[PDB]
Amino acid sequence: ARPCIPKSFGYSSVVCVCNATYCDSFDPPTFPALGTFSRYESTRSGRRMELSMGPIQANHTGTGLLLTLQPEQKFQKVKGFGGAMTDAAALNILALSPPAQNLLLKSYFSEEGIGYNIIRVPMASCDFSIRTYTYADTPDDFQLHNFSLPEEDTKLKIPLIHRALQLAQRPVSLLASPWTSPTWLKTNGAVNGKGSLKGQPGDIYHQTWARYFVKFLDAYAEHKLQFWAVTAENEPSAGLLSGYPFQCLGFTPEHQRDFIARDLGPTLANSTHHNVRLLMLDDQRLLLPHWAKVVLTDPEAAKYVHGIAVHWYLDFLAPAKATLGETHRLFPNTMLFASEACVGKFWEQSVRLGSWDRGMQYSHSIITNLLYHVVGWTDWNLALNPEGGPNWVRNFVDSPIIVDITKDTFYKQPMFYHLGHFSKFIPEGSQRVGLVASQKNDLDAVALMHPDGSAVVVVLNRSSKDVPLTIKDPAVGFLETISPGYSIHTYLWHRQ
């Protein structure tokens, strides 16, 4: 294990500096006897996933907030955590020298880093691309004889995905999402703007677009990569907006329903890739529950939909209970998955190196999602440059890893450690369980049980004040602790 080398860039906290020969890392996981807990702590003052152990005791000395584990109250099982292998992320990673590349990929994907087990893969170009291609730009090729993967896939994304999977001990799930079709399949003949598929569900355009998903899965399978899931379209609502500035494809909820029922579901079902799951929406949660009602009340569509993918950036427009909570209530057997998280307030830089606030927004998001049935998370770009790019629209935003190619250096932002407090300690198949607060409080907290029955609890303090805290496990006893101002803690313990 090597500790964080901190650097300040004038924001509220530090980044951790990594280069070709040095990156902060953990020892292999090692858990103590019954009656002992492990605690990982990150603070604005600069602690970075620092490990301590202490006792779980029969006597309760705390007189403040008590959080009681309720392991018999069982909620959703976790699919996992990860991020997006965009053209931009791949270009940034591959501009580092190979030993620095390896330390960046280990940070995300190794047991000595934060244990990502999901990668989101754009199907061809998006805003985080240096140009505007699809896999079939040759027109009137309805059988897609001329479908092919460019350099962005075969040189940048695919090789990095292989390397991520080699580093990971956990099985990694790949999730694919398209931004645009070939422009010759669109009403507007453009990669962006207001435009849908030509014609109507079932026709040659819709069948060709469904066939494009299979050709994509075929091409990645030729490179020994298989997908867990695909989404029906990235942000289908974007392609209904006049002037939408980057790659999109517009679907009303009704057009998505009929595309899935008539074309995408049947085409995937008749392929060698019939085991690949299909997620719907892949868009802002303010569109719920309406979008879920329109698609999932049609059995011919609902039979092909595994889950509902949500994006975070317009979360402040619509509360979790009215969107995620009501959707679960109406469709309790259709999982919710967060497929795109994003941060970067119109008066701030795209990238703020060492922003504690942006880190707290990530952990607060993850806890709210877990409290409203969400089973997984994919962050957006795995890495960007210090401008938040490259992006062909200049739609610059923040990322948990910032690469400075000119110094063969990468910086791990507070966002990286806020994500890791979840991703490292919540493996696939973990189940959220009850955690009861004894009184009103300012903390964000969530409890889960590992597949082996061991406990994990995350506690976020977004306040400036230290909060004395007891955690009770009815089977073990009392963990007496403190949640410092501007801190995040992950607690782990055996229950027998």
Next chain:
Amino acid sequence: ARPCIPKSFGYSSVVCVCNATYCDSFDPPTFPALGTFSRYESTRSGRRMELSMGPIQANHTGTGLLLTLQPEQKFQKVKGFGGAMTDAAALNILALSPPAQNLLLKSYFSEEGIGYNIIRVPMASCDFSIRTYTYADTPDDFQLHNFSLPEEDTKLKIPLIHRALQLAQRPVSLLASPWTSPTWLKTNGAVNGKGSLKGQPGDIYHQTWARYFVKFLDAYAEHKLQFWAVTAENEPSAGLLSGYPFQCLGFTPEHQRDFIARDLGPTLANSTHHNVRLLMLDDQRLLLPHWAKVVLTDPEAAKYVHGIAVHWYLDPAKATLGETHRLFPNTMLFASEACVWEQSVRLGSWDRGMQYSHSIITNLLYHVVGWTDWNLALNPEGGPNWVRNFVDSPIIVDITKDTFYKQPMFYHLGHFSKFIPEGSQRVGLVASQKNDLDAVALMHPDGSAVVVVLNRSSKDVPLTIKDPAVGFLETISPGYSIHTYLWHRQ
């Protein structure tokens, strides 16, 4: 009546061009004869509040969309419509030659224009200012002995407000809102950024800030202007945000509750300005209903609060506005600020016009009694604005050409403001089938009917409106149109 002079700037629709000697206007208002209806139409294709009249028919057959009036299903009474006399708006208006100024003010405030009866007045500087003053910038002036109105009030805002009221036949209501206090009343000692009043409600900082409201009202009254209402603060949630880029003053809901209960309510009530109403929140409706519950469940605060002011951000009404009305049905909701990748000003944008009328209809369907635009006029950059926070406005002034452009937004607003007088009551309007149209119905004080219909689709929609007192209005909603229908009921 003079028709629109259209000009394209290459976007979806046209502006109407006005100058020192020409501006589009209406003939004095008339009412359609009993048994007939009036229709005013604006289209993307270029029609601007064009008047036609049709017969009300005794019978109707067919499968087509029917909207039925429910005159006995009564909802909110309307306070009115208008916009904001910012420093930026007044500076732009007064840079035109005097005759062009008069045609601009007539466009908004005349019965021959669109009949505005609201003006929102910033208390000192905001982002739509060219500098960052307050009325009391002398440090630690707790007695406000150096309170004074600068030239932005005495030379720009106040003279234009007097001229607006002179042109309006309808009584105009003035609404006042502060962005920042003096910096010496603030924890951060700056006009912008994260910062709230120093100390605690009841103390000398909070009493001084409340007496600043009375000094403002006193100074405007010395200029023979009286206010209908003040808000407790513009966007109090903004001053809770680090780096907030322009004038702000942070309040949590609890701080707003306690400032109103301890300081602003009693101070206003003990003044010669006790008839002035107080609106709370003056912020994004996503803060409802929580903010309303915090303030209005305290009787010590509730007894001072007439209304809840909401801001729109145009670019879920039931859960915010609807739930608030349900909890607090005797506390009016009022939309006090609305504005619209793309460039700040898009001359001739039909899309931005449709955002305005869609907003007003959604608001009217959820208990809102009034709708206040932001800047009455900006320049073609969307300024001036000291932080470059440029936005669009229904009227764009081209000082170099002594010209102003009436945007589609102006006509989308006018389809409501011109035809919905103060005291109009929203009534029920039921669709016979699901449809892409936005519609709302109201009754004028005098009993007559008004219906606005907006079509945000490309498809013409045949439709009938049924009023059981008179019969059937057979009409069409063309794609990318807005219509206002008027008829007498007896």
